[PDB]
Amino acid sequence: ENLKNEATKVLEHVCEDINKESYGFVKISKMKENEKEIRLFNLEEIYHSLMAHLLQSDIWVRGRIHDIRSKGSLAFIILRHKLYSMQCILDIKHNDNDKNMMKWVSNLPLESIVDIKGKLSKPEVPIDSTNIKYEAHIRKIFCISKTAKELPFLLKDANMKETNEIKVNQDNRLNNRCVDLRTYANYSIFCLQSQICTIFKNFLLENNFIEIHTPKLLGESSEGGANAFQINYFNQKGFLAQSPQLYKQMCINSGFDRVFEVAPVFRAENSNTYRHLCEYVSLDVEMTYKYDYLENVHFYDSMFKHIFTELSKGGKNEMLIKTVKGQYPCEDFQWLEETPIFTYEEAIKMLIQHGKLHLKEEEILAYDMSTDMEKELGKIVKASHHTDYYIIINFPSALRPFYTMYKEDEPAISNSYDFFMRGEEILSGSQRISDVNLLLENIKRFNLDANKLNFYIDSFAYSSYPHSGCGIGLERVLMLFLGLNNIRKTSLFPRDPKRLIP
Amino acid sequence: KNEATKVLEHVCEDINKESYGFVKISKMKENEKEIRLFNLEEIYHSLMKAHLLQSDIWVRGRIHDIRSKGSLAFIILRHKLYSMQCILDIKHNDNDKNMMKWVSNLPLESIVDIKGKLSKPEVPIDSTNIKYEAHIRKIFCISKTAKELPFLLKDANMKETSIKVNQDNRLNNRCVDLRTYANYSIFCLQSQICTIFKNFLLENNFIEIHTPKLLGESSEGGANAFQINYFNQKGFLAQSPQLYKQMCINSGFDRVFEVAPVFRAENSNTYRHLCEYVSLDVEMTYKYDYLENVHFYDSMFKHIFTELSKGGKNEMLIKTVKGQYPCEDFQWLEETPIFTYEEAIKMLIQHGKLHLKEEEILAYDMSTDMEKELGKIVKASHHTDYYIIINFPSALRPFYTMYKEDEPAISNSYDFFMRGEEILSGSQRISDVNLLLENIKRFNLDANKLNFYIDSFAYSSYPHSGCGIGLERVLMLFLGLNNIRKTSLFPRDPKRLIP
């Protein structure tokens, strides 16, 4: 059985001089012992340069073993980095016929990280797997991090467009999120999430906004205490912020004029749905207006048209979106140069007219449109206006929060607005009550405790500029832009009433 | 003779006919002509760095100061860090003494729309950085101050020396306090730091991530973590995104940053730390030497200082802060000094600040007071406010810090300092799952509760490093302010949860 122990020695071989040797496990320190300094490439650089310094001589490249197929005297490794994959071929006949090198390579587990020294060349029929259409012929291969554990599922299965033709279910993916995020579509999803944050902030900064950061530990709930997480804050009773609502208004009352925040909020929703989470990233805007709050509404509208335009343009966003759609197909998000705006009353009458809703004229003012009904409206507007994006305005005051300013001449109606993507709410906002006495009256009208809101209310007591604002769900915007079926696909480590882990 | 009160409280019912009064915004809409409403920032940038000078204009602002004498009233109008004097001379308003009475009675902080003519006086007053004046033709109040202010903004703007508006008074009245010229400027500079940080990282191929603050197990140690009941699960608030930013690198994202709150149940109430703050976090891979990333983080901060220190807007913001809170300009070198921890301690010993033998240096855990003493030494010897310490003792760093395999008492760790105080802490990470489990055991932590994090290393881990940065601390130390509560909008500390 000594033969088996010699074989074990080969399979476990640690390389001690990478100048003499062509394979083995190596500490990163020992690549310092190389006679030359190493210019190490990643696959993103290779893709963008090739799809001359890369084709001339042997190069060094690092990547994860996405796939490895042993075929006798040949072995085929697909290296992966981000979105990019490249085939690397070990041919024993080109490596002094070293059978132990092949034995060691065949034994490498998937997802292991290797540094390969090899020569790039363009084959006749390139692998259809790899978006790098060159192949590396391996001269040396060293493993700097060996996979230690059997994978919870295969990336080949996890990447598959889900059909009835192995599905990896959501629980398995979320439980092993650090493997799930390696699929091409999931990588692309979160690159796009970052893009949304960048476009949002850059548009606001170009329009003279400053970024603010307001606390999430509160003494009082921001949007209604029933769904606020409670905390013990040094023997005080505290809550997590459901929104930065109170503080962004306080900042406008303090003179900051145009503010935005990109930050977590926490909502103790006791419903476990496909489209909401208990923790999410709110994009909040608050700003003054001159004489009409519609000034700000048109501004928020231009902001979203800009987001859509920027998400839909350029090579890299196009590639990200196409990569998502490869696994999760959906028609491209559509919007108009003139966003359709409907009043709540008009929207109701449209739904009744299309036979989607039945109400007596008596029942129309108090009617509270369901999320399913908002989706039906989305379908109607998609058919009639050829857009996935529109605005509803003038909600009844009774259905909006206490800080929403009502129409002076028609108080049952408020100066409020929701924006919709594919028939689902992405943004909610309103003209704010900017008179401290009207604000106290509305707080009382809503049976809220003004004493507990004193720090907020007092911020209006030394003048208040006319102002409005909005709050936006980042994960929901991304989900609906891509047409994904669940908000857990656009939150990195989702939180819902059952899931605190990972 | 009660018509005087009706004058004082006058509500204007037609702005085309009248020249003063309280008005509803809807009433302004009744103006016969569309109103091009200017703010003081536009006026400053157009005039101080011609439409505004050939006609009556409309301007909105807050009444910062008001004085009247006879036929003249003087209003200082304020917006952001800009102020401009406006003058009512009722010889040019039909000698309407009632207008003078109504205007003179407006309370401070009231928001007014003024229709007037701009002109450049021979002698502009010194306090207004707009060196033009507005001669008032009409003035309407769209929001009247309702309550007496808790302190005068004139007092709150003064350099401290009789008058002093104390910190508790200010923070209990934060939305008034934030109107001082310095405080406005501080939080504009905070936003500048976030912008420069993100743009530098984006230009270097990073992506922004958002990771949860509701956790099943604390990220930096349970003694200082807030607990929460999460649907009858026992959880914590994140003290940092440490576990998740490493998990994102293990997931292949390669270069990530996060700008987000963290929560720390800090044992103490001190001038330089808070219980909630905004952490700027970076995590990235390296090729063969973690020092690659350290030099990168160093370039990031040099870039931040460079952009904060530039001419134009940022220079005016800094000047405005220093007007109330004077401090020497922040200085940094073209090449950042880097000291090992041992070198830093030996510098303290050489200057007589510490007495340690050689065999005691690595066991010594440098206090914040001694870090400050070191900052003074380095300012005197190297003429910089910014430097780096590397190679902290392993036993004094967190469990995820990789030690030097050939001298394990030392770690591949680093802190960055501004004016002698820590702004950044980070390290090469343990990226071998077996070494990670051993170090977790060595720090007597619970591998089972950290299982979701440990498991993220079990399917390979890239060589990687990272860092965490206190946003408010960076701003505080850049400006030389005496308290971190000056650089956090609504501060949280062990006593203060409100506002």
Ligand SMILES: Nc1ncnc2c1ncn2[C@@H]1O[C@H](COS(=O)(=O)NC(=O)[C@@H](N)CC(=O)O)[C@@H](O)[C@H]1O
């Ligand atoms: N549980 C959840 N999961 C994910 N996204 C969610 C969500 N709940 C809401 N959102 C998203 O957050 C947005 C704002 O939340 S909100 O409608 O409750 N409004 C406001 O809060 C006001 N302050 C805003 C203002 O008036 O400025 C929604 O439109 C969704 O996109």
Ligand SMILES: Nc1ncnc2c1ncn2[C@@H]1O[C@H](COS(=O)(=O)NC(=O)[C@@H](N)CC(=O)O)[C@@H](O)[C@H]1O
């Ligand atoms: N209570 C407080 N108030 C304000 N700022 C504070 C603070 N505590 C810390 N900071 C600031 O946050 C930074 C990071 O915090 S830390 O030193 O605890 N390190 C880490 O956490 C690792 N994960 C980082 C890594 O290794 O990536 C500090 O340098 C301070 O500037």
Ligand SMILES: [Mg+2]
């Ligand atoms: Mg809704």
Ligand SMILES: [Mg+2]
């Ligand atoms: Mg809503």
Ligand SMILES: [Mg+2]
């Ligand atoms: Mg320290």
Ligand SMILES: [Mg+2]
């Ligand atoms: Mg520290």
